[PDB]
Amino acid sequence: SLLPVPYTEAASLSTGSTVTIKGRPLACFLNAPYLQVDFHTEMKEESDIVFHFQVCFGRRVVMNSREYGAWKQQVESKNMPFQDGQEFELSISVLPDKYQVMVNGQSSYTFDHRIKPEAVKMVQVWRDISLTKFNVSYLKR
Amino acid sequence: SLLPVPYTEAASLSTGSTVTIKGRPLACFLNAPYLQVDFHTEMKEESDIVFHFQVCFGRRVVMNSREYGAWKQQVESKNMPFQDGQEFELSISVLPDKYQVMVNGQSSYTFDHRIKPEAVKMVQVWRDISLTKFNVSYLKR
């Protein structure tokens, strides 16, 4: 849609930051489109990932971190609030202990911090979606 | 690139048809981009798939068919001729007994026909690539 995918924005995160993403899958759920959101430690795409969030629409969600080039312990969820053929609103909040992921206003996943959120320098949103809105909030000290 | 992804073209295939695809992954191999090529029985994306070809760049290739809505026997290959960060040329030839997939001029995969190729009405190319060329040949009777 409006914003190009893969979408990359330089970013900083701390407690109280919220990342808001509005978009739509590019395929029906029968065809298993993916969505991936990665919080990176540098602008380079090969950099470490403090928070990796990957939706296989209609099947599962996997969350992980990539630290000094290597993937760590995967967290796999079968929770699937996303609806076939529908626009979604994703809200990722930085709490003191974890990221909290809201889908269409409903708490749907959390992921405890493995690396301090202050290590993030970039957010990338990619795979099989179009994007109409992306925002990182910067309202708190 | 030039051609929009997901890319859909109405198509017919028979023995001697060749589907040629030139493109580039949207991510480094460390980030595991995908490529998917589906030969569909109708223009609708939910239709059956006579030949499903899915590359997880740097990891594996899966091939299958989707028949009356259901996936059949997966064929999984670890052959990986695709090169990190590089443009690729894919050539899918319709032989009497199978599809043959050439990658950068090298025979790399084959898949025996489960449904007659004449059932194909559409080709879709999608996931994490850009496309610079797509052609279906129509030179033979």
Side-chain angles (χ1 to χ4, degrees), chain B residues 13-45 47-58 60-96 98-120:
Chain B
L13 302 176
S14 57
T15 299
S17 296
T18 299
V19 182
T20 304
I21 303 166
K22 185 177 300 188
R24 192 182 243 289
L26 295 175
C28 66
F29 279 19
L30 189 72
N31 288 350
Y34 291 70
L35 158 67
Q36 189 156 321
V37 178
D38 296 312
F39 293 178
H40 277 269
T41 59
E42 303 291 338
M43 290 298 296
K44 288 187 293 316
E45 65 168 310
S47 67
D48 286 352
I49 295 166
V50 169
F51 179 49
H52 159 78
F53 177 79
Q54 190 194 75
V55 184
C56 183
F57 287 105
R60 69 174 187 161
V61 170
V62 297
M63 288 164 286
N64 210 338
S65 56
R66 185 171 71 205
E67 310 182 21
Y68 283 92
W71 289 106
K72 306 296 253 186
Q73 179 58 247
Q74 171 167 285
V75 176
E76 181 176 14
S77 169
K78 302 299 178 63
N79 192 26
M80 191 50 56
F82 301 93
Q83 297 302 297
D84 198 352
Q86 302 316 304
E87 175 167 70
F88 58 81
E89 185 166 4
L90 201 61
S91 188
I92 302 168
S93 288
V94 185
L95 310 183
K98 65 204 150 207
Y99 299 100
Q100 176 167 221
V101 180
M102 319 286 283
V103 179
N104 303 322
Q106 163 190 349
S107 178
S108 297
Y109 317 90
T110 72
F111 184 88
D112 279 15
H113 298 306
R114 304 171 175 183
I115 294 167
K116 56 182 178 174
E118 287 85 3
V120 170

Side-chain angles (χ1 to χ4, degrees), chain A residues 2-45 47-58 60-96 98-140:
Chain A
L2 197 143
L3 309 167
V5 175
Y7 181 77
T8 300
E9 187 172 309
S12 304
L13 302 176
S14 57
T15 299
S17 296
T18 299
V19 182
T20 304
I21 303 166
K22 185 177 300 188
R24 192 182 243 289
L26 295 175
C28 66
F29 279 19
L30 189 72
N31 288 350
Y34 291 70
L35 158 67
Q36 189 156 321
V37 178
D38 296 312
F39 293 178
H40 277 269
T41 59
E42 303 291 338
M43 290 298 296
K44 288 187 293 316
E45 65 168 310
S47 67
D48 286 352
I49 295 166
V50 169
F51 179 49
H52 159 78
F53 177 79
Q54 190 194 75
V55 184
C56 183
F57 287 105
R60 69 174 187 161
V61 170
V62 297
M63 288 164 286
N64 210 338
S65 56
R66 185 171 71 205
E67 310 182 21
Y68 283 92
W71 289 106
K72 306 296 253 186
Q73 179 58 247
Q74 171 167 285
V75 176
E76 181 176 14
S77 169
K78 302 299 178 63
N79 192 26
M80 191 50 56
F82 301 93
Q83 297 302 297
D84 198 352
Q86 302 316 304
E87 175 167 70
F88 58 81
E89 185 166 4
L90 201 61
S91 188
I92 302 168
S93 288
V94 185
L95 310 183
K98 65 204 150 207
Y99 299 100
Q100 176 167 221
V101 180
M102 319 286 283
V103 179
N104 303 322
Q106 163 190 349
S107 178
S108 297
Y109 317 90
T110 72
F111 184 88
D112 279 15
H113 298 306
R114 304 171 175 183
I115 294 166
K116 56 182 178 174
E118 287 85 3
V120 170
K121 292 184 189 173
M122 180 263 276
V123 176
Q124 186 180 40
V125 179
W126 64 300
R127 308 232 191 237
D128 311 297
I129 67 162
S130 56
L131 228 47
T132 55
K133 179 193 182 65
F134 180 95
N135 176 265
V136 177
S137 71
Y138 291 98
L139 300 185
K140 277 159 201 154

